[PDB]
Amino acid sequence: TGDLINTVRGPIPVSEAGFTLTHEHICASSAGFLRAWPEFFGSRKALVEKAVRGLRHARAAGVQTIVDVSTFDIGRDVRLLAEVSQAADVHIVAATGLWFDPPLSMRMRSVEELTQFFLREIQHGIEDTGIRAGIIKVATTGKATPFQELVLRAAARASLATGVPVTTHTSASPRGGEQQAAIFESEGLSPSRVCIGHSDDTDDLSYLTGLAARGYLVGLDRMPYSATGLEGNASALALFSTRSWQTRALLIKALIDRGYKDRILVSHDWLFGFSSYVTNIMDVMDRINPDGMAFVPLRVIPFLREKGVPPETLAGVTVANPARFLSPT
Amino acid sequence: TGDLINTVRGPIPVSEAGFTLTHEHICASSAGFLRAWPEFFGSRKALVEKAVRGLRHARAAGVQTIVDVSTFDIGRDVRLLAEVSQAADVHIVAATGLWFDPPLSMRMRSVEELTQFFLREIQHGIEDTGIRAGIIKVATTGKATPFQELVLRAAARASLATGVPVTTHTSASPRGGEQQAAIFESEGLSPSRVCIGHSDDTDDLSYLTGLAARGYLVGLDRMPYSATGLEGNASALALFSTRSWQTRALLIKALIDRGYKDRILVSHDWLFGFSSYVTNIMDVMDRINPDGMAFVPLRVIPFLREKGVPPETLAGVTVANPARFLSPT
Numbered sequence A, B: 001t002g003d004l005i006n007t008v009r010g011p012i013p014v015s016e017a018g019f020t021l022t023h024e025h026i027c028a029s030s031a032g033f034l035r036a037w038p039e040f041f042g043s044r045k046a047l048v049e050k051a052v053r054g055l056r057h058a059r060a061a062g063v064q065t066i067v068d069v070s071t072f073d074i075g076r077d078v079r080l081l082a083e084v085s086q087a088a089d090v091h092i093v094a095a096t097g098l099w100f101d102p103p104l105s106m107r108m109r110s111v112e113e114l115t116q117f118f119l120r121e122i123q124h125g126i127e128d129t130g131i132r133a134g135i136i137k138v139a140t141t142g143k144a145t146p147f148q149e150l151v152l153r154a155a156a157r158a159s160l161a162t163g164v165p166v167t168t169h170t171s172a173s174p175r176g177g178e179q180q181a182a183i184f185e186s187e188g189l190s191p192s193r194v195c196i197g198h199s200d201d202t203d204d205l206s207y208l209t210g211l212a213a214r215g216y217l218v219g220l221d222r223m224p225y226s227a228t229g230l231e232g233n234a235s236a237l238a239l240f241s242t243r244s245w246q247t248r249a250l251l252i253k254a255l256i257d258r259g260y261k262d263r264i265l266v267s268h269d270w271l272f273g274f275s276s277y278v279t280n281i282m283d284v285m286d287r288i289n290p291d292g293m294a295f296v297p298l299r300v301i302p303f304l305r306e307k308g309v310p311p312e313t314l315a316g317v318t319v320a321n322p323a324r325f326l327s328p329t
């Protein structure tokens, strides 16, 4: 009680976030795209309706909060987030930061300028909406580019100023997480403010326990991205692993069994629209995972419980760890 | 009389466009950027005020219309254009198309999808504003990338469907214009619908008369980008030629003297905000060319007249050629 987090509908008590998915998207797009070309998604109205149905399904399954880690260059539309949050009765935390598609107007900026932009979105609000980011999303693509280093440093600085956590995208080992950690630490950022994302891309337990031992949160955040019979489909095969989802889920158990239950965040990296990839990709995705963002609560959590993970431990992972991560600290 | 063109304030008679600058920008930015970070420009209000002063200066000098060739990925903000057009009493023609900073949501699209997007902006309107593009801006960067080829073909197709002209960015010979022409012609686009831009980057008269002889408009569109004493300033030196502006202006005369007065468009490629380059670049630019978009009428046109170009010929270049180009055909 007492701690607050910013959502797209305003401030909420941390203790009300409940079962929280820490890496999700309503729509993965590009800056300006939803506004310039809503018909790409059928219509803005069809996108809202699909997202609200999806989030109502997740809510029925026990999900109370999602963290939408869509940055400016993922075409985050905070008005869309607010509308869907209100219609679905699911809290949504919005993000600042930058992903791997920054336009020239971002790429030309200094660390100090990027810091000011992240702080504006956290402290003032996004665009002219007054809605404030509750997380900072950064991405490196293999070995950090020089601009990516600036982004990571600007993220660390904005976090230090605000207590808001940082969450990352990594390529599949690299293993890019270690370089990100090195940059964050050089800026004096506490690892407990940081989630190293897409850490389920590989079953490298030494990499993962290495990060966890240092205080980092490990984002096991692509839980439903497993499929069979996609070889005649190059673009779909790129997204979906041959590893069963059971294998991804066993990584959560592996980390719990090694003493790191407090260092784990679980999510889907799901979405209801996707213009930054091939056309009609959603048809493929929705056929594979019709449960959408209810996949974790419906499938992953019962599987772990059935494998002997205690309910208190599962509660800790899905409720306590997100609460501690999101609480400005 | 009778022909109409779309402007950001609605339809106007072609014959009212008058003295027209065919390649200009209010603000060179990135999709979404003005909305997410207006303080970059001081404020949106400061940007409007700077642009209105600039355009009032151009208007006092005789300029009646500008064509703002800012595409989606130049962060074109048609509401900004409408506000500045109204306050300055200068017509502004808006653009569709894509420049060299498309986000992933554009880069993943097919020629057919890009065609639909260009047509939406021409026939339906931009975003939700109802303001329709009156020109299609494309860019190649040296040798056309595969995606750039799609853009050029989608531009040709949208032009054929609507009669709206196409205008291009080229690197400084390449000479990229010839490849652009080859693609346009393969799509059956008439050269008289096409302006090959930044053609004043080089004094290659054979290249230029070659295009002009085939019916293309040649865009001599960086008239004020000449300066001295910039060597201690790498970023400024990149924009500004050591060639005096007199030398750029002599290229207009060279083309007129060779019989191609009807194939020439003259402009500045000026702007009042510039976030897609280094910070404070505007301070440099405004010190070099304080006349802004009045530079052509105040300096270039009198210089040509003083060199013996007949007034009727100068009228033809600045008024008739833009009218013929912009008239949907």
Ligand SMILES: CCOP(=O)(OCC)Oc1ccc(OC)cc1
Binding pocket: A025, A028, A239, A269, A271, A276, A277, B104
């Ligand atoms: C599975 C969704 O993850 P993604 O990194 O997008 C952010 C949600 O998907 C991609 C989008 C564009 C890409 O460029 C080629 C690659 C992956």
Ligand SMILES: CCOP(=O)(OCC)Oc1ccc(OC)cc1
Binding pocket: A104, B025, B028, B239, B269, B271, B276, B277
């Ligand atoms: C002089 C203004 O021309 P520019 O091509 O911008 C469109 C108006 O300027 C540039 C902007 C970004 C660049 O990327 C490195 C290069 C030129």
Ligand SMILES: [Co+2]
Binding pocket: A169, A170, A198
């Ligand atoms: Co990611």
Ligand SMILES: [Co+2]
Binding pocket: A023, A024, A025, A069, A269
């Ligand atoms: Co993601």
Ligand SMILES: [Co+2]
Binding pocket: B169, B170, B198
């Ligand atoms: Co250009």
Ligand SMILES: [Co+2]
Binding pocket: B023, B024, B025, B069, B269
């Ligand atoms: Co330009």
